[PDB]
Design an enzyme around this catalytic site. Structure first.
Site, short mmCIF file in Angstrom:
data_model
loop_
_atom_site.label_atom_id
_atom_site.label_comp_id
_atom_site.label_asym_id
_atom_site.label_seq_id
_atom_site.Cartn_x
_atom_site.Cartn_y
_atom_site.Cartn_z
N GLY A 153 0.90 -1.20 -0.04
CA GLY A 153 -0.08 -0.09 0.04
C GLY A 153 0.64 1.36 -0.15
N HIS A 205 -1.08 -10.90 -5.07
CA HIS A 205 -0.67 -12.08 -4.51
C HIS A 205 -2.05 -13.11 -4.87
CE1 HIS A 205 1.39 -15.25 -2.67
NE2 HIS A 205 1.14 -14.75 -1.27
N1 LIG Z 1 6.52 -6.36 -0.40
C1 LIG Z 1 5.44 -7.03 0.27
O1 LIG Z 1 4.74 -6.41 1.27
C2 LIG Z 1 4.72 -7.91 -0.66
C3 LIG Z 1 3.35 -8.16 -0.58
N2 LIG Z 1 2.37 -8.46 -1.52
C4 LIG Z 1 0.77 -8.59 -1.24
O2 LIG Z 1 0.68 -7.45 -1.17
C5 LIG Z 1 -0.66 -7.73 -0.11
C6 LIG Z 1 -0.75 -6.67 0.73
O3 LIG Z 1 0.52 -6.90 1.74
P1 LIG Z 1 1.34 -6.03 2.70
O4 LIG Z 1 1.23 -4.56 1.98
O5 LIG Z 1 2.64 -6.40 3.13
O6 LIG Z 1 0.33 -5.74 3.83
P2 LIG Z 1 0.46 -6.71 5.49
O7 LIG Z 1 0.66 -7.99 5.26
O8 LIG Z 1 1.55 -5.97 6.13
O9 LIG Z 1 -1.09 -6.39 5.89
C7 LIG Z 1 -1.20 -4.84 6.66
C8 LIG Z 1 -2.48 -4.36 6.26
O10 LIG Z 1 -3.64 -5.20 6.63
C9 LIG Z 1 -4.50 -4.53 7.22
N3 LIG Z 1 -5.36 -5.70 8.06
C10 LIG Z 1 -4.70 -6.46 8.82
N4 LIG Z 1 -5.86 -7.12 9.40
C11 LIG Z 1 -6.92 -6.66 9.22
C12 LIG Z 1 -8.13 -6.96 9.25
N5 LIG Z 1 -8.49 -7.96 10.44
N6 LIG Z 1 -9.02 -5.99 8.80
C13 LIG Z 1 -8.66 -5.09 8.27
N7 LIG Z 1 -7.55 -4.67 7.69
C14 LIG Z 1 -6.69 -5.46 8.35
C15 LIG Z 1 -3.75 -3.51 8.05
O11 LIG Z 1 -4.51 -2.61 8.73
P3 LIG Z 1 -4.26 -2.27 10.35
O12 LIG Z 1 -3.05 -1.40 10.39
O13 LIG Z 1 -5.53 -1.46 10.73
O14 LIG Z 1 -4.00 -3.66 10.87
C16 LIG Z 1 -2.78 -3.24 6.98
O15 LIG Z 1 -3.23 -2.21 6.13
C17 LIG Z 1 -0.69 -9.20 0.10
O16 LIG Z 1 -1.60 -9.80 -0.86
C18 LIG Z 1 0.57 -9.49 -0.02
O17 LIG Z 1 0.95 -10.95 -0.24
C19 LIG Z 1 3.16 -8.50 -2.58
C20 LIG Z 1 4.26 -8.57 -2.89
C21 LIG Z 1 5.37 -8.57 -1.93
MG LIG Z 2 4.36 -12.96 -0.69
#
Ligand SMILES: NC(=O)C1=CN([C@@H]2O[C@H](COP(=O)(O)OP(=O)(O)OC[C@H]3O[C@@H](n4cnc5c(N)ncnc54)[C@H](OP(=O)(O)O)[C@@H]3O)[C@@H](O)[C@H]2O)C=CC1
Ligand SMILES: [Mg+2]
Ligand SMILES: NC(=O)C1=CN([C@@H]2O[C@H](COP(=O)(O)OP(=O)(O)OC[C@H]3O[C@@H](n4cnc5c(N)ncnc54)[C@H](OP(=O)(O)O)[C@@H]3O)[C@@H](O)[C@H]2O)C=CC1
Ligand SMILES: [Mg+2]
Ligand SMILES: [Mg+2]
Ligand SMILES: [Mg+2]
Lengths: 359, 359
Positions: B53, B135
């Protein structure tokens, strides 16, 4: 069996590395003007021109120290030195002539060639000269190398923990590769000071204390381990499992080599492993915490066995026998060609070519 | 057993990666003027604010695209978005309000939360909207995640093969992390064009084709392997054996982590494994060539285990359970804390403080 006296602080400045105070010297202890004054009567004769002679030599030259190169005339290193601007007759000579001219003799020949040439160079390391190494290989494994440093000269070591190519390039960037220093023989009461000053003069970042024996066991172990042999075996194994399960080469290479070197491994190096974990997803964190103990246990037997091959002398024998051959250059290049022609690296050439900064 | 349909060239531009033609798109195919026109009537509603994000959202925002963030109000993501300059009520909203405003719904919640929120979010992803993942986790493992995207919207994927921190930092150098692109559902005939345009718009380097299933399998396997879990396990095991044999921490850390990330691993990434080998000593090359097949053999069973744990769904199930917990942040942190307090990483702190560039 017997233990070994610990490294001694001697009341010197120290840094606590996770529960051990270590002797540490930093560039500000040896500024450029001080190095020049200290060495103003010295001539560093750098013997050999592999990547250490390149990085150490060019850094010494840039720092204004009186450094010359000694290599086999009209061999490969001779021409390599010419193309870095060393001028035959001014600061490039054959080995015997360089040693006659120098006061500090930096033995940076191949470890194999250090053994082969030693009967001829030992009579030239006379009183008042200092003998210097960047690896404990030759003087420590005397039963196999036959290298006995003369008892009337200082014998010092400065060991950069990186490729000679990066010793040069980091120094140019304002950075620097770390170095070990060690004293194998002190006859003047100045071997240590010369080893530390040398360590800074060659462009090191910080310098820490070791011994010749500790250094050679560490060095031989790491390069066979994750520094070169382990990382490559890891890449090969992971890539193969992906290719066998249908994943295209571009996918398998990006998930094995590219994502590592272009993203995650630099984060480890800039901020530590926890920071890199926290910079990835919750999924990859759960996955990586689950599996790193499984990878540690799968590799620990391999590592204690590799350390044994280092301590008992097998790896040293191997290098003396292979690299001691006159055609060592030709056959090493053969095995590097095998690496070049693996799918994973043929794919790498194409992946790298697509990088926006290569377009 | 059943086989699968290969990836379809479909007569598009292709690059040969070691004997395999692959669909590759490049930045030149989507100049900035084209992108901003193609998306001029769209709103990217980016749901979630982890690394992706942060990286994708800020790259879209700097690029000029109409992007908004949607995250739980007053949680950690919300706080970080406000620090990153997103403005509540302008381009920062809660999850539902963001989706309502958006035409391209980028689901970048944690893969556990994607499954948790999906019954409430599904009715909001209405006709004329596009669902986007980075993903293949959710739709592919539907039996465990219960995520079934609607049949009347385009469902697409752009998966940056690197941390979201690197997606951001490389973008700000004119470089980029590579992305997979894939299509889960195409009801318009424009889903592929959209996935590729998004991959370029968020700052990718080059974009290669995959499928949702191929992406999640290789991705989960990669991060658990040498990307994060595998490199950690290797470091710990190599460092422990050295410490078990009396080597000081600064020596053991430099011979394991520092030389790797600061010297040798950048050489692999910039010119490949053979170039790195040739930049090192004849002794290091002899040892590395003698041991990379041994590390490959010792590791490949661990990797066929890993791929099977990914294939059958144990890894996905593991992450669904652990990360789906409400206290996932502090539970994951606790395990990160054990990492921080490992001897190797406490040492690395002091090693990093000593770098000349950090003075
Ligand atoms: N480098 C990377 O990070 C990579 C990740 N991806 C993919 O991108 C996607 C996002 O990953 P990433 O950015 O790392 O995010 P994270 O795995 O760090 O998830 C964090 C986010 O999830 C939200 N969240 C967690 N639990 C809940 C819940 N119960 N209800 C609502 N919101 C929730 C958090 O909000 P809050 O702060 O309120 O908990 C925050 O916005 C995934 O599909 C991942 O596999 C793809 C390539 C690599
Ligand atoms: Mg991954
Ligand atoms: N990054 C590194 O390379 C590191 C290495 N070191 C240590 O530095 C020292 C030098 O290593 P490196 O610089 O890589 O050198 P190499 O191991 O690549 O050795 C190449 C040099 O050896 C000479 N040489 C080889 N065979 C003979 C021979 N039979 N007679 C005479 N000269 C010969 C070559 O000259 P020619 O072209 O004529 O063969 C050339 O000058 C070693 O002790 C090494 O362990 C220290 C830190 C890391
Ligand atoms: Mg070393
Ligand atoms: Mg990934
Ligand atoms: Mg060595």
């Amino acid at each position: 069996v017997v233990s070994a006296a610990p490294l001694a602080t001697r009341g010197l400045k120290t840094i606590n590395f996770g529960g051990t105070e270590e002797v540490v010297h930093e560039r500000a202890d040896w500024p450029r003007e001080k190095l020049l004054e200290y060495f103003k009567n010295d001539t560093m004769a750098l013997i050999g021109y592999g990547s250490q002679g390149y990085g150490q030599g060019l850094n010494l030259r840039d720092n204004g120290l009186n450094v010359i190169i000694g290599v086999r005339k009209n061999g490969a290193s001779w021409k390599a030195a010419i193309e870095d601007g060393w001028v035959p007759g001014e600061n490039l000579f054959d080995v015997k002539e360089a040693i006659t001219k120098g006061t500090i003799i930096m033995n940076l020949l191949s470890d194999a060639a250090q053994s082969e040439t030693w009967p001829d160079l030992k009579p030239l390391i006379t009183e008042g000269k200092t003998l210097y190494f960047s690896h404990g290989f030759s003087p420590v494994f005397k039963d196999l190398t036959k290298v006995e440093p003369p008892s009337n000269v200082d014998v010092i070591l400065a060991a950069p923990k990186g490729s000679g190519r990066t010793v040069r390039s980091l120094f140019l960037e304002g950075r620097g590769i770390n170095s070990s220093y060690a004293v194998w023989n002190d006859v003047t009461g100045k071997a240590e000071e010369k080893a530390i000053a040398m360590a800074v003069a060659i462009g090191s970042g910080y310098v820490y204390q070791t011994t010749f024996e500790r250094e050679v066991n560490s060095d031989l172990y790491g390069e066979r381990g994750c520094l070169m042999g382990g990382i490559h075996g890891m890449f090969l194994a992971q890539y193969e499992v992906l290719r066998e399960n249908g994943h295209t080469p571009s996918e398998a290479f990006n998930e094995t080599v590219e994502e590592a070197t272009q993203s995650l491994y630099p984060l480890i190096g800039k901020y530590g492993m926890d920071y890199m974990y926290d910079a990835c997803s919750t999924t990859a964190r759960r996955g990586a915490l689950d599996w790193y103990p499984r990878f540690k246990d799968a590799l620990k037997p391999v590592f204690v066995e590799l350390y044994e091959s280092v301590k008992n002398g097998t790896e040293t024998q191997r290098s003396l026998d292979f690299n001691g051959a006159p055609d060592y250059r030709e056959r090493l290049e053969e095995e590097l060609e095998t690496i070049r022609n693996m799918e994973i690296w043929k794919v790498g050439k194409e992946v790298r070519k697509l990088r926006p900064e290569n377009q």
